[PDB]
Structures are given as structure tokens and as C-alpha cells.
Amino acid sequence: LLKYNVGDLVWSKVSGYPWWPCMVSADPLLHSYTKLKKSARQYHVQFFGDAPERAWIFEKSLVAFEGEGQFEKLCQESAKQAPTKAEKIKLLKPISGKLRAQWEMGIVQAEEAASMSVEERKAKFTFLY
Amino acid sequence: LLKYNVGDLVWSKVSGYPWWPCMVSADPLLHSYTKLKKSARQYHVQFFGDAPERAWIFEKSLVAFEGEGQFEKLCQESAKQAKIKLLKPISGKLRAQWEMGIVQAEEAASMSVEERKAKFTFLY
Ligand SMILES: *[Se]c1ccccc1C(=O)Nc1ccc(N)cc1
Numbered sequence: 709l710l711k712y713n714v715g716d717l718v719w720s721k722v723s724g725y726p727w728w729p730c731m732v733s734a735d736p737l738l739h740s741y742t743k744l745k746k747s748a749r750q751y752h753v754q755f756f757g758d759a760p761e762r763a764w765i766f767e768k769s770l771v772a773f774e775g776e777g778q779f780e781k782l783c784q785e786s787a788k789q790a791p792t793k794a795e796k797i798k799l800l801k802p803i804s805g806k807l808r809a810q811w812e813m814g815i816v817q818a819e820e821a822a823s824m825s826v827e828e829r830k831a832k833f834t835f836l837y
Numbered sequence: 838l839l840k841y842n843v844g845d846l847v848w849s850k851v852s853g854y855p856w857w858p859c860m861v862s863a864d865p866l867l868h869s870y871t872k873l874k875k876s877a878r879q880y881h882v883q884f885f886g887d888a889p890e891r892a893w894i895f896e897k898s899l900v901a902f903e904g905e906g907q908f909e910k911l912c913q914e915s916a917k918q919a920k921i922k923l924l925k926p927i928s929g930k931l932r933a934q935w936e937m938g939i940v941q942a943e944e945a946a947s948m949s950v951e952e953r954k955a956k957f958t959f960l961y
């Protein structure tokens with residue numbers, strides 16, 4: 709009903725990006741982890757990878773994390789839901805360069821976090837402000 | 838035609854936050870600083886203050902940064918555009934971050950765009 713909770717591992721769909729492996733956390737500054745922007749709701753996540761990035765992301769753009777094997781399937785539904793064939797084709801981009809390297813880092817870290825207890829991976833990966 | 842460029846100080850309005858001082862910058866991973874989310878244009882900023890946060894923000898949610906003084910004014914016209922939700926005290930660790938990032942923003946407004954691109958951009 710509240711689909712996610714702090715510590716839940718999620719994929720984030722961010723514009724301009726492939727699906728990115730994440731963890732739900734509380735905002736260091738706001739102290740919440742979900743809010744109403746006034747009734748399609750956000751969750752605050754951390755992005756995995758050696759970049760310590762964080763964001764508030766819409767429920768509509770999160771998907772609970774099951775493993776790297778989800779990935780290909782996730783991108784199809786992103787395409788299954790695009791209007792024209794100018795948005796459904798806009799996803800055929802190769803993940804290369806620094807972006808792939810960060811992404812791989814993120815995916816490896818997410819599986820590292822997936823095999824953990826929630827209260828474990830909470831205390832190991834949550835950024836300390 | 839493009840309302841900002843790499844090195845421009847702007848205020849950004851992120852929901853649930855008070856207006857934040859930022860610099861327009863190139864996304865290190867995407868290698869762009871502006872894009873169409875497709876007819877709502879975004880720019881990529883980095884939020885001043887010691888936590889190096891960066892985001893794509895909408896053009897509708899950015900104002901150019903002349904100095905701390907506009908804060909009041911900016912907020913009042915935001916609250917007139919919903920409403921009572923922005924009537925909260927900026928306190929604690931958020932006020933500390935905010936005040937820190939404002940300070941860095943005023944400092945970069947004296948420099949040339951070259952000066953501030955060197956000093957203030959993030960090494961990624
Ligand atoms: Se979602 C996906 C599946 C297969 C191949 C590529 C993608 C993808 O999102 N690629 C991509 C590459 C680069 C950038 N900047 C965004 C997206």
C-alpha cells in the first residue's frame with residue numbers, strides 16, 4: 709500500500725538515463741523518505757555506484773529490484789509505454805563510456821546489497837551526512 | 838534561445854525544499870547541460886554547499902541568481918503560485934547547508950565564468 713520502505717532496493721527510471729539500481733533512504737536534510745508532490749507520490753533514493761548521488765523519484769518510475777536479469781525486461785516496458793515511435797526508439801542507445809562503468813558499479817553493489825538483511829544494508833550503504 | 842549556459846548561477850525550486858543556489862553544469866555522465874524531457878526543457882545544475890548534489894531541473898523552476906536578497910521575493914511569488922506549505926522555518930542541518938551554499942554562490946558571482954567553472958565544478 710506504501711509500496712516501498714527505507715532500505716528497499718529499487719530501480720529508478722531517470723530521464724536521459726537507463727534504469728539505475730537504487731536504495732530507498734531518508735533525506736539527510738528533510739528526514740522523510742516519501743512525500744506527496746498533490747497525490748502522485750515520491751520516494752527518496754540513493755543511486756548505487758561510486759557517485760554518492762541521491763534524488764526524489766516518482767512511484768511511477770521505481771520498480772522493486774530482483775536482480776540484473778530484470779534489466780532487459782524493464783527497458784521493454786519503458787518502450788512498451790512510449791507514445792510515438794520517436795520516443796519508443798529513443799531508448800536504443802548503447803551504454804558506454806563512464807556511464808556504463810558507473811552503471812556496472814551500481815549493479816554489482818545492488819546485488820551485494822540484495823544478499824543482505826535490510827537492517828544490514830541500511831547501516832552499510834546509507835550515506836552519512 | 839537557450840536561456841542558460843555552463844557556469845550560470847541560478848536558483849532552483851525543488852519540491853519540499855526552499856529555493857537553492859546552484860550552478861548550471863555539464864552532466865559528467867551524459868555530457869550535456871540541457872535537454873528535452875518532449876517539450877519541457879531541463880538544465881543540469883549542481884547545488885552549492887558541501888554535499889555535492891546535482892540534478893536535472895526544469896526551466897520553469899529556475900531563476901537567475903543576483904544575490905541572497907531575492908530569496909524573500911522569490912519565495913513570496915512561489916507561495917502566491919500554489920501555499921501555506923512554504924511557511925516553515927529553515928532550521929538545523931538544512932539551514933546549515935543552505936547558508937553554506939548561498940555563501941559559495943555569492944563568491945562565484947564575483948568571478949568570471951571561467952574562474953567559477955574551474956574552482957567550483959565537481960571532479961567526477
Ligand atoms: Se534501458 C536500455 C536497454 C538496452 C540498451 C540500452 C538501454 C539504455 O537506456 N541506453 C542508454 C544509453 C545511454 C544513455 N545516455 C541513456 C540510455
Ligand SMILES: *[Se]c1ccccc1C(=O)Nc1ccc(N)cc1
Nearest residue numbers: 853854855856912923925926927
Ligand atoms: Se522559501 C522560505 C522563505 C521564508 C521562510 C522560509 C522559507 C522555506 O522555504 N522554508 C522551508 C523549511 C523547511 C523545508 N523542508 C522547506 C522549506
